[PDB]
């Protein structure tokens, strides 16, 4: 599924991401935009052999098990397939655990390079929330 901007903003808000551990809703929408372009079925095989899955491109080397990555720590205790659903519940729950680490949202390269430092709240502007 390819989310519409305000559609995703509302979903993420319902899923408790607005101001989760200090990160305003706009941060999450922006991250989803630059990581997957709002596409829940996005998958990108990394060089090291791991794969990024879902709307927030969560990597299989540490966060989920795709049963094909030798390292796989599966910290979110979930099959990576669960991150490819049109139901973002699994991705959000995993993202919350990820961001709860010391690195926070820096775990996402796209956010670090395209969102951090900008007016991220622009990403939810014009949306009824």
């Amino acid at each position, epitope marked *: 599924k390819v989310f519409g901007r305000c559609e995703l903003a509302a979903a993420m808000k*319902r899923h408790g991401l607005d*101001n989760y551990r*200090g990160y305003s809703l706009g941060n999450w929408v922006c991250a989803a935009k630059f990581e997957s372009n709002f596409n829940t079925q996005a998958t990108n095989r990394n060089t090291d052999g791991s794969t990024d899955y879902g709307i927030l491109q969560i990597n299989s080397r540490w966060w989920c098990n795709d049963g094909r990555t030798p390292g796989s720590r599966n910290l979110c*205790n979930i099959p990576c397939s669960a991150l490819l659903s049109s139901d973002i519940t699994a991705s959000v729950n995993c993202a919350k655990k990820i961001v709860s680490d010391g*690195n926070g949202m820096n775990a996402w390269v796209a956010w670090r390079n395209r969102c951090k430092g900008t007016d991220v709240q622009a990403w939810i502007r014009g949306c009824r929330l």
Partner: antibody, heavy 113, light 107 residues
Framework: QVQLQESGPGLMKPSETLSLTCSVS????????WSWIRQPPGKGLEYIGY???????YYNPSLKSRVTISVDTSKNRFSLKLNSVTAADTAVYYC???????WGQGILVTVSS | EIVMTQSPATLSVSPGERATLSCRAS??????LHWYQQKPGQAPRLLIY???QSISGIPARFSGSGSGTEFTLTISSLQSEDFAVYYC?????????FGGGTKVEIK
């Protein structure tokens, strides 16, 4: 089938350092986030802090930088250290997996002046 | 820190009755609210996570609802083994905080 078990001294004197450990079975200590929570007698629950996969820690400001949480990957367990204890620290101490799915059974630590 | 307030402090329930427990947050916490059940001499047991998500093995009579600053735990038809102290806990902001608890006891 995951099991957490707290261990350590159940009695101590004021000003001393409280030291507890939580051993895990059925899960890898190096593969998750781990927490400590306490419950003073007849009172509610107070979150002490947690350590994440990268080793980063988060401590409750109410403890005034007196707390340390560390991981011993070699023995699949993590510990809690609380310096300069007083009667206010008497409580049942619990360890749990960060997501909350599994908790230890708790260990009573009494600071008897 | 976010202050969590539960009500009532004590809830008398007759076996078979519907039980409604309330938990409010001093500020919005989205759906980042978890419910725990604690029986005497036992550790708290997670029943509901992220306000309404159910946990495998937990009876269907337990249901969580609410968002923002007002949350509710409903036991559709309380059974005798449900008597215990229930706590809510928010995870939206560090330090994580627990409500003061609601002691559910037989009537």
């Amino acid at each position: 089938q995951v099991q957490l078990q707290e261990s350590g001294p159940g009695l101590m004197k004021p000003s001393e350092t409280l030291s507890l450990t939580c051993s895990v079975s059925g899960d890898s200590i190096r593969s998750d986030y781990w927490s400590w929570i306490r419950q003073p007698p007849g009172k509610g629950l107070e979150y002490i802090g947690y350590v994440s996969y990268s080793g980063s820690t988060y401590y409750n400001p109410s403890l005034k930088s007196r707390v340390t949480i560390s991981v011993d990957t070699s023995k699949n367990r993590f510990s809690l250290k609380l310096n300069s204890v007083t009667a206010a620290d008497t409580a049942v101490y619990y360890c749990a997996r960060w997501d909350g799915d599994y908790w230890g059974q708790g260990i009573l630590v009494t600071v008897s002046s | 820190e976010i202050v969590m307030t539960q009500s009532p402090a004590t809830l008398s329930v007759s076996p078979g009755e519907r039980a409604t427990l309330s938990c409010r947050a001093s500020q919005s916490i989205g759906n980042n609210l978890h419910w725990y059940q604690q029986k005497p001499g036992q550790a708290p047991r997670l029943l509901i996570y992220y306000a309404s998500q159910s946990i495998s093995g937990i009876p269907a009579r337990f249901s969580g609802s609410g968002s923002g600053t007002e949350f509710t735990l409903t036991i559709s038809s309380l059974q005798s083994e449900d008597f215990a102290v229930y706590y809510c806990q928010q995870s939206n902001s560090w330090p994580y905080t627990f409500g003061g608890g609601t002691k559910v006891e037989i009537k």
